[PDB]
Symmetry: D4
Subunit: 201 residues, 8 copies
């Protein structure tokens, strides 16, 4: 798990606008995955499963980081902005605030670099809890390798900050909850979309 090969993979890459943005990102997510050290060696079936389970947390981590320099807002993969106001107006205010508060702003205060982001992603990607994996222990092994390199990296680049490694990992539960919330809102809009119901709201 050379952390360098991971950083390389990263570099290698309102509701209507946000969903199209997510789309653009999904269009090349398999490409990104294929760049992570041993992902390609996992059974093809284990690969789809890992991606199916982590796609939105992954994306939520990507756009969050990319938005570190946006004034109370998010920077879509599409180039457009979405600010706290539009989000509230669109009915996705509460979760949008979680994004800024729990992910964006906190990734900004730590000055979380790409290498670190990629790792967190790589980690969420190698999720042993993914249902139906052929060999879970295998997957487990690949993630402990990632956070091993990751902890090392953090010790090298940020020796003054000894608790950064943990601190980084502690952003994963926030990505977990936000993600579940994301999918819930996604259902809703998908359910009321293009029906007179939507015109209402």
């Amino acid at each position: 798990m050379p952390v360098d090969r991971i950083l390389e993979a990263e570099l290698a890459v309102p509701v209507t606008n946000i969903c199209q943005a997510a789309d653009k990102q999904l269009f090349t997510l398999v490409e990104w995955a294929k760049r992570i050290p041993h992902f390609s060696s996992l059974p093809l079936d284990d690969q789809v499963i890992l991606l199916r389970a982590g796609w939105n947390e992954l994306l939520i981590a990507s756009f969050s980081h990319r938005s570190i320099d946006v004034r109370d807002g998010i920077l879509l993969a599409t180039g457009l902005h979405v600010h706290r106001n539009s989000a509230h107006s669109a009915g996705v205010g509460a979760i949008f605030d979680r994004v800024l508060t729990e992910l964006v702003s906190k990734m900004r205060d730590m000055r979380m670099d790409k290498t670190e982001l990629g790792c967190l992603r790589a980690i969420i990607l190698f999720n042993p809890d993914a249902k139906g994996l052929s060999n879970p222990s295998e997957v487990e092994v690949l993630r402990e390798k990632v956070y091993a390199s990751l902890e090392t990296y953090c010790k090298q680049k940020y020796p003054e900050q000894q608790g950064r490694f943990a601190k980084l990992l502690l952003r994963l539960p926030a990505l977990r909850s936000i993600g579940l919330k994301c999918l819930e809102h996604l259902f809703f809009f998908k359910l009321i979309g293009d029906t007179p119901i939507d015109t209402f709201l």
Copy 2:
């Protein structure tokens, strides 16, 4: 639009089982699209849009054809079978019958070849009605090229059958309706999945 280029793209590639099957197929759908003659030259944004709008009709056409030699059933991209009985038992009986009646059996009686399938796919892929396309006329142009080559092909290989070209095109509306129905059932199961409600049925 060389029809051979298309055929090459094709060759290049119960509810829980069916969804995992669809997943496996989505994992490489972009790859398939990238093999169609001029798809890659369309703006990236127009590419995601075309795929978002045609993914399930596309997949429904693929598994339908692949199932031509299955006794009252479907042959998943996963290798497993799903027969009319399991489908009814799973609550997806009515649409499952549409698949066999309107797509599978009719693709079987015509002895619809891969070249022809790929074209129909290529056609659904180049859908000018896709919302948000930058250059729609451009997309329109690419599909009329596909069905031009397609009609030619049909004239060459099946001269005795002069109405086959139309006959082929007339399977598209069935894919349209079945597809919409598919997504509806997909919502439902996605909606009650992993909830005590699912235990109920």
Copy 3:
């Protein structure tokens, strides 16, 4: 299956206003059907079935064509207009746009004539996928006759445009989807009509 006999059948003939319009059209739909070449020879039971399955696509095609010269709007069978604005205000904006974009405007650019419209209708009428038909192959035969005459007609009147026949057929899937959408909205309004709920919206 002379195309002339079909053209003669054609010639032979906001939500509250739209529904009353649809009504006026249903009042004589059987008459129109009875004018199509061999429709009357099909078992009576097969006749009701064909009409039950195609009534709204049929009507949607009729009013769409009739609206070719309306500024961003639809020309009801009642003489009244309904413009993009009223539709959005009424909550049927999204589908109304599909009508104008996918049907009206595209029928207008092609300068789709009555003879061609009638055929498309005749074709949707002879739908072999109609559930419960006694003799499906019989119905299949009648539609391939229609599109045979239709392709011929298109070759005669528009020799310069060799792809027009296909192009015409490719409007059927749009009528399929729009139609299903239509029925869905119809349920909704039928469900909240004359109830305090409708007042609230």
Copy 4:
């Protein structure tokens, strides 16, 4: 408004089976209406409106009468039977009992003839309460003519039975309520039809 001409109009003509039955009957309802004395002279718009408002009461009166000689059941316009048992099993037990109790059996005890049935129908057809009629007073006039001839007829053929005329009219409110109930069940089945929900039931 001769009762004879009415009688002539009449003579002139489980849930899946019942609905197809209703369909068969709708296929020629306009024909039946066109045979009633002055219906054809009413504005075309007033004609559609009258049929839209009375179609199911009308049909419910037709099949009820037709079922006078059926053992605890209904005789569909399709020839098939539906017995109290199938109806209960299908979830339409309560209203089905109203049909037999309030309409069928009571039409059977009175030995209600076709002439009388036709009139009741003609009466429901000329409904001044129909929303949107151009000239309601005109419609009102046509119905009082019908029940005028009807009362006369009843005095002629059944002199010993002086209260029969009223007795007949008093079956109209039962047709009204049953009809509204019918449409409600119709929504429900149309709403859960061909969806996994249906399979559950």
Copy 5:
């Protein structure tokens, strides 16, 4: 069934306001019933059943008649008025219009007297279709007596108007439908009452 004893019984007697009004009327409905000729002789159980089945049609007939001299409105048993405007604003516009159009205005044009009203009431009261009556034939007999006296009365007081009797009876189906509608709205308001839901609307 002396019609006089009936008239005697009659003489003997916005949503929040309307319901309290209905209440006031229910408080003495048994009293009114007890005044109808043979009602008291029917088994006590048959009496509750008749009242349970006819209470709202009865009341709807009472307030409708009482409102004959109100400008586009209803005169509650409470003395207060409710005009077409408040009703629409309250979400009960559609049914409120049926009341005025189908009942009030039509009772006004005929100059329907109390004696006639009472009879219609007495008639709805003696409803043989009431579920669970011990002796229905008995009830049937009492209603044919009422409309016998009623027809006689109409012949005496209004000899020039020979069709008035029928005309009167023909208002019963309108009371039937309006009544069912009434109960439906009643459920709704009872369902959303005193919940933040109501504050909304």
Copy 6:
């Protein structure tokens, strides 16, 4: 407030069966109320209001007491029984158990007499919290008179039991909750009654 006047008023008087039972009881509830000391002197409007707010608690108290000698069951005002088993089978098990546990059995252990029951009733009847009362303090005054006589009575007949008066009053909150629950179940059954949904359970 003579307690004897009250006792005199009292003496003066599965889901389908239970509701018909409640009906029988409502048929004469006004009569019972009119027998309570000063109820008749309250404005008529205040009378309907008190009855509207207390009808089910009142009835629930009546049938509960009447059921003191029933083996795990309730004795309807109709003479029929309903036992813990039928209730559970009917879906009203939980509340039915509250009736037996909180009301019946506890009224049985205390050997709660009619005089005491009537009072509790009289008390619930004179409810100052009833919304819309003209003179609330007046109503308040009448209930404190009732429980004054009540406490006296309890001191006279049961001198050994000094806490019985309180104990009696402490059964009112149980009648309050059970009552609200009752109305809720009543909505539900009223909501799915006579619909295929009811056939379902």
Copy 7:
């Protein structure tokens, strides 16, 4: 069961604001309970059960009393106010009025002291109807002790008012109903909270 020990337990201690207020109060509710005379001696299991069943009535009684000197409003345990206006604006108007009318204002007119409040609380706490109590009679015994001391206290401090004891107890049913209502609204807000639905309202 000295009333003094209870008074000492008491002394010992817009929707978003109200819920946080309730929270603050729950944070120390067990502490309060542990201060009531024999509560701690009851099986631990019986203790949780009593608190689970009475927590909101208890809290509702606490904040109501604490609000005796607030102009048409409530004084949260948080120090903040919530006035009749904010409540209506928040959709909790109806129940909020019940609080002021049935609890606050009435506790204010009686000049209900802390000792008396505590008792009422202690009483609701020792609720024998609590489902699953191991020894119910035990609990029953503890509440009759409370209202025994309470009645005594009321006789001592307020000899001129002999009906005060009853009067106090008669506030319990109002706390029962208001409480059930409270929980219902609580579900609703908990159900639509942080969802686009809450935004819309």
Copy 8:
């Protein structure tokens, strides 16, 4: 922030059974919190907020660990067992499997000790993402202290296992998701509880 004091706090302490179990645990949760090093020094308001946000994850971690020696099941705080079978039968199968798979079994394979459990708990308790905290940075500081001691402890007791610390933290996202799922099921059961709906299930 000595891990010892944490360990000491820990030591210091089917759906109907599970909820009563959760209850028993809530009854003393504040006590447990008060034992964590600096929790008591945080503003009282910050204390309630932290507990409100972490109560179920906390409990879910407690019962999970406690269940390490249960054959395919959970060991309630009540002493009772709940096995995979009862859970599925109760409709909570899917989440129950997540508990065993993601928490129980994985806590069992690592041989996760109490000291480590307590820490994870202490960590979830000091959640800076808790909405409405007065001083979040303060809370953040307390959690980094906990995982600092925790990492140290893990290095001391398990020197051969260098990745255990991370491995432990990586169980937090699973607790997050499971927790959200838990609350969702909790709503559902609370919503259909004690209603005929419950009896159906």
